Amino acid sequence: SGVGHSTGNYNNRTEFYYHGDEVTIVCHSSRHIHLNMSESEEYKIYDTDRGPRFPTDQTLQGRDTINDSYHAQVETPWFLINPNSWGTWMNPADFQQLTTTCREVTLEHLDQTLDNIVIKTVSKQGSGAEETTQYNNDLTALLQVALDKSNQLPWVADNMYLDSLGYIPWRPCKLKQYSYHVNFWNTIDIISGPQQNQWQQVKKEIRWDDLQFTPIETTTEIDLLRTGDSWTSGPYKFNTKPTQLSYHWQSTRHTGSVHPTDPPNAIGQQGQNIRDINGWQWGDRSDPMSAATRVSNFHIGYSWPEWRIHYGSGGPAINPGAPFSQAPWSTDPQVRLTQGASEKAIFDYNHGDDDPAHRDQWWQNNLPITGQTNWAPKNAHQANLSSNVPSRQEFWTQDYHNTFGPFTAVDDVGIQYPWGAIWTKTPDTTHKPMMSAHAPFICKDGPPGQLLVKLAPNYTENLQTDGLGNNRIVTYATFWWTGKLILKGKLRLPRQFNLYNLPGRPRGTEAKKFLPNEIGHFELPFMPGRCMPNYTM
Amino acid sequence: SGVGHSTGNYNNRTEFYYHGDEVTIVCHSSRHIHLNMSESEEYKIYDTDRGPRFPTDQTLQGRDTINDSYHAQVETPWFLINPNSWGTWMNPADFQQLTTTCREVTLEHLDQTLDNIVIKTVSKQGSGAEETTQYNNDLTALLQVALDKSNQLPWVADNMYLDSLGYIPWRPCKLKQYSYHVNFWNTIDIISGPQQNQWQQVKKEIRWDDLQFTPIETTTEIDLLRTGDSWTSGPYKFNTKPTQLSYHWQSTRHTGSVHPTDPPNAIGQQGQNIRDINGWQWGDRSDPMSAATRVSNFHIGYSWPEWRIHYGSGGPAINPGAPFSQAPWSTDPQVRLTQGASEKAIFDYNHGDDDPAHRDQWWQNNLPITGQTNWAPKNAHQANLSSNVPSRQEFWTQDYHNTFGPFTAVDDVGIQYPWGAIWTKTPDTTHKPMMSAHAPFICKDGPPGQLLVKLAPNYTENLQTDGLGNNRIVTYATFWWTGKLILKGKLRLPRQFNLYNLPGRPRGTEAKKFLPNEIGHFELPFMPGRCMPNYTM
Amino acid sequence: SGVGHSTGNYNNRTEFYYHGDEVTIVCHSSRHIHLNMSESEEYKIYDTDRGPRFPTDQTLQGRDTINDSYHAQVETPWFLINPNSWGTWMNPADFQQLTTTCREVTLEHLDQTLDNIVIKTVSKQGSGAEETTQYNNDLTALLQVALDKSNQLPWVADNMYLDSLGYIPWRPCKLKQYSYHVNFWNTIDIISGPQQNQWQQVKKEIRWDDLQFTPIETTTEIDLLRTGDSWTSGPYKFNTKPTQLSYHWQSTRHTGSVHPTDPPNAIGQQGQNIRDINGWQWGDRSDPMSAATRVSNFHIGYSWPEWRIHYGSGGPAINPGAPFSQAPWSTDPQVRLTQGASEKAIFDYNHGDDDPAHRDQWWQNNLPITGQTNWAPKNAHQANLSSNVPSRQEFWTQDYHNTFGPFTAVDDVGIQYPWGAIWTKTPDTTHKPMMSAHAPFICKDGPPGQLLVKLAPNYTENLQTDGLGNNRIVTYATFWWTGKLILKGKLRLPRQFNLYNLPGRPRGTEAKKFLPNEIGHFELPFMPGRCMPNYTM
């Protein structure tokens, strides 16, 4: 190109192609990215404060230790571009088209580019209120671009902390610095002290002798780009497995053969369960034949120590448990039952909040997903199962056992449209996780490579080793990210006689939200991604 | 054919073909099926009573809520033919031949037909004790036949409720109507009230806005058959995995290298465990070297909250746990220990009971399967494992934890000959069950399609919309189902020097049972299907 | 075939095929039809009573003369099978699939058959309460089948009077006799008498000298069918034009360039219309430049003498006017404004009512269709249009003029799912109608031929010319109609950023309707067929 030729165009429109039972979705996305000169040109390793609302005393007996943010990390001068959110890609009407017409979807491949690089230096004349800023584009300045296609850098592209390209095509995007954890010990003893009601710090430190420090420079090759230059990543092919776009309402009581019933006679009458019937029960039960004790081949859902806080080497964390809905147990609407492994997105103006300077939030309670719902305290167990009822003993109620086992069938959450991550890195361990607690797609052979960008340091006349920022000219860049990810769906067709409830906005919400304001402010709606019902087995 | 030509024959004999280490079993089966005019020509959706022996009060503190039969369902006018039981296929001597000569077996493919359709209308003349019935065959009447080869209907072909073609070749079979569950909430709180000793209904209702209604007519294509007509399903090919025809007696103490022992000298003496030996223990143990604390690679069996009652969206159900034998713990014969995930078949005259008007029962306690036996209260855990014994603390006994994990190896029940189901539908969920609590074969790509039959309604002169059965002529049909399923076994050969105990009748039983009576009444014997012992590892 | 072979099968399932922007919908439908012996074997010509609720006096000044049912007709012994309703074809979930995924649809071709003919004679023995009916199938009896593929018979297949094959696949259908109007004069003078407030009959008579009588026998060839016989119509190809599956919200004030506006500043402020602007107005207006008087190229909608009663040769009728919504004018919900050329379906158990012995009704007020809404009394006209406002004179308000003209653009109603007709006969006149007030498809070259059926008369031993029904044996038939119509849609894709409101049940309704009952009773929902919004110009 040159100084005066643009190196790319803008395509943010998505494509749907229906042939047979297959549906190809080509999602185009384009962003205008504002980049600033790095705060420091150096890599920094440091630990942090314990975080806000962490206990300084034992008044709460240490139940507040779940508010630990403590950690250690390497501060990279680079910046991360991840398009790892749904909604960086599709608009609300495009995701509605996806989930109405597709029963499941996969990731096919990903492309992305960077072009129309503009680098400006900001100069100031005069002083005081007479100070005048001038923005001069530096035509010979460089932008540094690193993509690790070999996945040799630590992966932090999880959309957690919602650091991702924004969801609204016409607004500018602003990157966050690339940073990763180093080895540290944070171990908190909540059993400490007499009566074992006190919490105590055991070890909180950076672990230096075991630590790993990988810079971007010695790891991946870096492209240096002027104004007339562009960058393409090349094709990336996913290998994942499809995600279900429907939700399952069947429990193990909704599942198999139906208990023999005598039909009702008139419009007010109910069916009657037949008393003497033949079939397979579990224990010695031969007379009750309760549909409850009917033997089944599998079991849908499992119990857990809901809100399991694992106090590990790095600190307390949550061990999630299975997703489901508390709607069958809900009763009072005011009380909010979080125990279905619910999640909550806290988001901002670029990520689909209408208000600048304040953040909005969405608690996904997973209401459509029932039949998987297992509240651990509601369960029980008996010593024996037979024609006799056990006594006060022989019967236990509130336990909180993990009942995951070889016979259980569960679901995952699925796509969570605006704020949910798309793919995920697979942990490199002897036993790889069977499924993911958040991201619908697990990458079997390496996640899409991380695109890291940096402005090359632009130095003044004098260069002093003692100097940091006083030594470089104040600089910023704006450029354009474009990307294309392609999806493969499977055509959804009616499986029932009656009308479906088709995808749409969340229940209590209206449509004046989600539409631009007099100032241009609007939100993106939550789209479940498991949308319409389907049979399990 | 025509009115006066028969459209098929009767083949109920089974074939064994031995070539090399492979053995092909071709099971032929033929049934004479009696069908009646549907009670109603319409689809009905209704819920039921809570069931017999369900509590109307809190006297039992709500431990009787396991007797819940409540549910909701769509009443289809159609009728189900499922040959999904073992024993619809093989007679006792044919299944003995299978389990003696085969170490494992698979399902190969299935064929089935319907032919020799006979439809009669029953007319009555006179009134009172002079009333005379006449049975006239209606040559132009139709039989409706629907097979869903695409598995688009809810699957209820689980042989639970023993609704399946009968086990005795020369007796007539009688179908049950096809029915399936709809979406309903049944949630029972057994924690309710002060002291948390009371039970309460939370939500019991049909869930109408989320409900799915699929008729047979809008789903699958229906064949209309006269007398001279027949129906073949076409070939169905299973893809499953083999089932083990042997039982495993080895626990993790029966498994690996043997503790070093000094042999006995004379006929009364025992071996002595050598005191100072070298090897891998678990904790700091270096001196005891107890075979108990020898490290092993795996563990055989797992604990569970035996008789786990999961109170889910549809109601309470049992979360099974692993099958095993209580025989090592049995002691007193009178007490019946159900905790090995035992099952009980309640069956009737056509399904292998000798007495009409009464039902017999068989409690399968799984006695041969040991080494998998884990009674959860009998276990323990310690804080540390070392050359020292822990104190009163540091040692816990009755826990009921699920100990299934990454190192565990377990079995399933296997074939349960007369009353057990053969195959099963795989639940459509993110995590598919690792194995099945009952049916030995899991269908990876769709279960054999369900054959639904119906008599077309035969109407009188006048047709009134207000009329139901007063509008159609009283009609019934008899026809002949034939089917062929083929099995692939692997030849069993002696692995030991000493004599085996070969398959036969259950232990306490005699042979005057299982043989016809002066009236022709006899039972079919339970055949374990895991019959002879084998080594695990 | 023969007596004992069935001549066809049952396929009621619908198919969707998506390739590119084209979508083929193959609708299969199958009905079980109950036919009775004709009331008379002869053609009858007669006139009727004036009808219920017609005035016998002048108390209402003759405004009740709109309740005239009077007419004359030829009574044919034959019976009509018309599948001319939407909903004879698709179920609610299949029509939802159509209107979500298609922006417009055409009719492609139609096939239909008749098979599995069963003819029974009913005999009675004894007398009194001892009387015994016997139903004997007469194997040599005939069914008469006439299809006029040349459209030489009068066409009465308009689904008006909802005489059409039923909407529920599993219920029996019952035909109505074929009948058509003859030439009669009915002329009512509502101007009669002094003060012109009285109504009077002018001429009410059958017009015999001009009358036309066409039997089925001398017109079309008739097929005679035994039990082992079937009938296929052959292919019929439609030539029609597509119907729009979207509704238009734009009026002529929603349409073109927008009035110049000064945008709002903060969240509560509104835009301000700019005062001095340049553009094309209508009259001498140069200063006001009201968006109202902006010249436009076309005009959307037209006024009418709403509820125009044309007193013609055959009697009073309604001259419809354009369809639109009264929702912008609605205000009070209790008052029901009918003036948008609304329609009302009155239907019964087979046609989608849940209650037998009572009828339900649906008033289609066409609420989504706005921008076409022209209430004639709300309009006005002025003498001159200029910078001056006219006086009390020069301005007229309540007029009721027909404002249809050369610049107007209007819509039609579109598909009305359960009860609406599909196609229509084109009147043979010098000026053919531009569009249709009800049926979405006008047949340019002949409507699908009418299928007329009749049982051949089955006579007793003696045949007397004086005898009518006393001469023929009491007979009825049941048989099976199958048909296939194929549609061509155009793929609907998102035209907007925000979420659509997707097709579903009518607003105030719940889903416990539309789903089967404990007795099996349910309704079919109204599906608009103009479902989602779209831009006009």
Side-chain angles (χ1 to χ4, degrees), chain B residues 294-307:
Chain B
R294 179 183 67 87
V295 55
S296 60
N297 296 329
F298 312 111
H299 195 273
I300 293 169
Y302 66 91
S303 299
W304 184 271
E306 180 64 16
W307 299 144

PDB file of all heavy atoms in Angstrom, chain B residues 294-307:
ATOM      1  N   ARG B 294      -0.789 -52.225  51.303  1.00  0.00           N
ATOM      2  CA  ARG B 294      -0.037 -52.339  50.062  1.00  0.00           C
ATOM      3  C   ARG B 294      -0.624 -51.419  49.006  1.00  0.00           C
ATOM      4  O   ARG B 294      -1.829 -51.447  48.752  1.00  0.00           O
ATOM      5  CB  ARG B 294      -0.061 -53.773  49.543  1.00  0.00           C
ATOM      6  CG  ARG B 294       0.693 -53.917  48.238  1.00  0.00           C
ATOM      7  CD  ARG B 294       0.623 -55.291  47.669  1.00  0.00           C
ATOM      8  NE  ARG B 294      -0.720 -55.638  47.234  1.00  0.00           N
ATOM      9  CZ  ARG B 294      -1.216 -55.369  46.035  1.00  0.00           C
ATOM     10  NH1 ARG B 294      -0.483 -54.750  45.137  1.00  0.00           N
ATOM     11  NH2 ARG B 294      -2.444 -55.726  45.729  1.00  0.00           N
ATOM     12  N   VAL B 295       0.224 -50.611  48.371  1.00  0.00           N
ATOM     13  CA  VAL B 295      -0.258 -49.780  47.278  1.00  0.00           C
ATOM     14  C   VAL B 295      -0.641 -50.662  46.104  1.00  0.00           C
ATOM     15  O   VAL B 295       0.009 -51.671  45.813  1.00  0.00           O
ATOM     16  CB  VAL B 295       0.785 -48.721  46.886  1.00  0.00           C
ATOM     17  CG1 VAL B 295       2.010 -49.359  46.594  1.00  0.00           C
ATOM     18  CG2 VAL B 295       0.391 -48.021  45.621  1.00  0.00           C
ATOM     19  N   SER B 296      -1.748 -50.315  45.463  1.00  0.00           N
ATOM     20  CA  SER B 296      -2.196 -50.948  44.241  1.00  0.00           C
ATOM     21  C   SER B 296      -2.477 -49.867  43.211  1.00  0.00           C
ATOM     22  O   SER B 296      -2.600 -48.688  43.535  1.00  0.00           O
ATOM     23  CB  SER B 296      -3.430 -51.816  44.490  1.00  0.00           C
ATOM     24  OG  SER B 296      -4.498 -51.037  44.983  1.00  0.00           O
ATOM     25  N   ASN B 297      -2.563 -50.284  41.957  1.00  0.00           N
ATOM     26  CA  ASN B 297      -2.779 -49.363  40.855  1.00  0.00           C
ATOM     27  C   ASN B 297      -4.227 -48.919  40.744  1.00  0.00           C
ATOM     28  O   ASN B 297      -4.492 -47.776  40.366  1.00  0.00           O
ATOM     29  CB  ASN B 297      -2.350 -50.023  39.550  1.00  0.00           C
ATOM     30  CG  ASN B 297      -0.880 -50.313  39.509  1.00  0.00           C
ATOM     31  OD1 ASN B 297      -0.085 -49.601  40.092  1.00  0.00           O
ATOM     32  ND2 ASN B 297      -0.514 -51.408  38.873  1.00  0.00           N
ATOM     33  N   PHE B 298      -5.169 -49.792  41.067  1.00  0.00           N
ATOM     34  CA  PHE B 298      -6.573 -49.495  40.889  1.00  0.00           C
ATOM     35  C   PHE B 298      -7.293 -49.843  42.176  1.00  0.00           C
ATOM     36  O   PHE B 298      -6.677 -50.210  43.174  1.00  0.00           O
ATOM     37  CB  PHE B 298      -7.142 -50.266  39.699  1.00  0.00           C
ATOM     38  CG  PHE B 298      -6.287 -50.173  38.473  1.00  0.00           C
ATOM     39  CD1 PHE B 298      -5.608 -51.275  38.005  1.00  0.00           C
ATOM     40  CD2 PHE B 298      -6.176 -48.991  37.770  1.00  0.00           C
ATOM     41  CE1 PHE B 298      -4.832 -51.188  36.880  1.00  0.00           C
ATOM     42  CE2 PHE B 298      -5.395 -48.911  36.648  1.00  0.00           C
ATOM     43  CZ  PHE B 298      -4.727 -50.006  36.204  1.00  0.00           C
ATOM     44  N   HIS B 299      -8.608 -49.703  42.162  1.00  0.00           N
ATOM     45  CA  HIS B 299      -9.424 -50.170  43.265  1.00  0.00           C
ATOM     46  C   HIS B 299     -10.714 -50.728  42.698  1.00  0.00           C
ATOM     47  O   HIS B 299     -11.290 -50.154  41.777  1.00  0.00           O
ATOM     48  CB  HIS B 299      -9.709 -49.066  44.271  1.00  0.00           C
ATOM     49  CG  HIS B 299     -10.222 -49.569  45.582  1.00  0.00           C
ATOM     50  ND1 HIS B 299     -11.558 -49.800  45.823  1.00  0.00           N
ATOM     51  CD2 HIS B 299      -9.571 -49.919  46.713  1.00  0.00           C
ATOM     52  CE1 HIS B 299     -11.708 -50.250  47.054  1.00  0.00           C
ATOM     53  NE2 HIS B 299     -10.517 -50.333  47.615  1.00  0.00           N
ATOM     54  N   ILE B 300     -11.153 -51.853  43.238  1.00  0.00           N
ATOM     55  CA  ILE B 300     -12.299 -52.577  42.711  1.00  0.00           C
ATOM     56  C   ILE B 300     -13.505 -52.260  43.581  1.00  0.00           C
ATOM     57  O   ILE B 300     -13.540 -52.609  44.763  1.00  0.00           O
ATOM     58  CB  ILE B 300     -12.021 -54.084  42.634  1.00  0.00           C
ATOM     59  CG1 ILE B 300     -10.939 -54.344  41.590  1.00  0.00           C
ATOM     60  CG2 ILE B 300     -13.265 -54.840  42.267  1.00  0.00           C
ATOM     61  CD1 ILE B 300     -10.407 -55.714  41.603  1.00  0.00           C
ATOM     62  N   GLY B 301     -14.485 -51.589  42.996  1.00  0.00           N
ATOM     63  CA  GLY B 301     -15.720 -51.227  43.656  1.00  0.00           C
ATOM     64  C   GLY B 301     -15.672 -49.815  44.214  1.00  0.00           C
ATOM     65  O   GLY B 301     -14.627 -49.168  44.272  1.00  0.00           O
ATOM     66  N   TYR B 302     -16.840 -49.334  44.635  1.00  0.00           N
ATOM     67  CA  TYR B 302     -16.916 -48.031  45.271  1.00  0.00           C
ATOM     68  C   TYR B 302     -18.097 -47.988  46.231  1.00  0.00           C
ATOM     69  O   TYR B 302     -19.077 -48.719  46.080  1.00  0.00           O
ATOM     70  CB  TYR B 302     -17.010 -46.905  44.238  1.00  0.00           C
ATOM     71  CG  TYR B 302     -18.265 -46.879  43.406  1.00  0.00           C
ATOM     72  CD1 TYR B 302     -19.369 -46.161  43.816  1.00  0.00           C
ATOM     73  CD2 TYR B 302     -18.333 -47.537  42.202  1.00  0.00           C
ATOM     74  CE1 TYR B 302     -20.502 -46.128  43.067  1.00  0.00           C
ATOM     75  CE2 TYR B 302     -19.467 -47.508  41.447  1.00  0.00           C
ATOM     76  CZ  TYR B 302     -20.549 -46.800  41.885  1.00  0.00           C
ATOM     77  OH  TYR B 302     -21.696 -46.753  41.138  1.00  0.00           O
ATOM     78  N   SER B 303     -17.996 -47.074  47.203  1.00  0.00           N
ATOM     79  CA  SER B 303     -19.082 -46.883  48.196  1.00  0.00           C
ATOM     80  C   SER B 303     -20.104 -45.896  47.637  1.00  0.00           C
ATOM     81  O   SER B 303     -19.822 -45.279  46.594  1.00  0.00           O
ATOM     82  CB  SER B 303     -18.534 -46.379  49.500  1.00  0.00           C
ATOM     83  OG  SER B 303     -17.623 -47.306  50.062  1.00  0.00           O
ATOM     84  N   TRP B 304     -21.233 -45.736  48.326  1.00  0.00           N
ATOM     85  CA  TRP B 304     -22.313 -44.858  47.821  1.00  0.00           C
ATOM     86  C   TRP B 304     -23.203 -44.513  49.007  1.00  0.00           C
ATOM     87  O   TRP B 304     -22.983 -45.091  50.081  1.00  0.00           O
ATOM     88  CB  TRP B 304     -22.971 -45.543  46.620  1.00  0.00           C
ATOM     89  CG  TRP B 304     -24.037 -44.754  45.929  1.00  0.00           C
ATOM     90  CD1 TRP B 304     -25.372 -44.732  46.221  1.00  0.00           C
ATOM     91  CD2 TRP B 304     -23.862 -43.890  44.794  1.00  0.00           C
ATOM     92  NE1 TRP B 304     -26.032 -43.901  45.357  1.00  0.00           N
ATOM     93  CE2 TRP B 304     -25.133 -43.374  44.469  1.00  0.00           C
ATOM     94  CE3 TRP B 304     -22.758 -43.499  44.031  1.00  0.00           C
ATOM     95  CZ2 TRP B 304     -25.325 -42.486  43.414  1.00  0.00           C
ATOM     96  CZ3 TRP B 304     -22.947 -42.624  42.986  1.00  0.00           C
ATOM     97  CH2 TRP B 304     -24.215 -42.130  42.683  1.00  0.00           C
ATOM     98  N   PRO B 305     -24.175 -43.584  48.882  1.00  0.00           N
ATOM     99  CA  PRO B 305     -25.131 -43.345  49.960  1.00  0.00           C
ATOM    100  C   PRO B 305     -26.185 -44.385  49.563  1.00  0.00           C
ATOM    101  O   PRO B 305     -27.170 -43.995  48.973  1.00  0.00           O
ATOM    102  CB  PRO B 305     -25.627 -41.917  49.717  1.00  0.00           C
ATOM    103  CG  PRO B 305     -24.508 -41.245  48.950  1.00  0.00           C
ATOM    104  CD  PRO B 305     -23.901 -42.345  48.108  1.00  0.00           C
ATOM    105  N   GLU B 306     -25.959 -45.663  49.888  1.00  0.00           N
ATOM    106  CA  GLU B 306     -26.862 -46.760  49.433  1.00  0.00           C
ATOM    107  C   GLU B 306     -28.327 -46.392  49.655  1.00  0.00           C
ATOM    108  O   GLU B 306     -28.646 -45.875  50.743  1.00  0.00           O
ATOM    109  CB  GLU B 306     -26.539 -48.073  50.146  1.00  0.00           C
ATOM    110  CG  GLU B 306     -27.438 -49.224  49.722  1.00  0.00           C
ATOM    111  CD  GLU B 306     -27.310 -49.643  48.266  1.00  0.00           C
ATOM    112  OE1 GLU B 306     -26.313 -49.262  47.625  1.00  0.00           O
ATOM    113  OE2 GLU B 306     -28.210 -50.351  47.777  1.00  0.00           O
ATOM    114  N   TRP B 307     -29.178 -46.689  48.671  1.00  0.00           N
ATOM    115  CA  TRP B 307     -30.608 -46.293  48.741  1.00  0.00           C
ATOM    116  C   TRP B 307     -30.658 -44.767  48.776  1.00  0.00           C
ATOM    117  O   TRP B 307     -31.295 -44.214  49.685  1.00  0.00           O
ATOM    118  CB  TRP B 307     -31.321 -46.990  49.903  1.00  0.00           C
ATOM    119  CG  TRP B 307     -31.285 -48.479  49.742  1.00  0.00           C
ATOM    120  CD1 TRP B 307     -31.167 -49.415  50.726  1.00  0.00           C
ATOM    121  CD2 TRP B 307     -31.326 -49.208  48.500  1.00  0.00           C
ATOM    122  NE1 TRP B 307     -31.150 -50.674  50.189  1.00  0.00           N
ATOM    123  CE2 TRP B 307     -31.245 -50.578  48.827  1.00  0.00           C
ATOM    124  CE3 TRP B 307     -31.432 -48.846  47.154  1.00  0.00           C
ATOM    125  CZ2 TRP B 307     -31.271 -51.577  47.855  1.00  0.00           C
ATOM    126  CZ3 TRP B 307     -31.452 -49.833  46.193  1.00  0.00           C
ATOM    127  CH2 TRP B 307     -31.373 -51.179  46.541  1.00  0.00           C
TER     128      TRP B 307
END
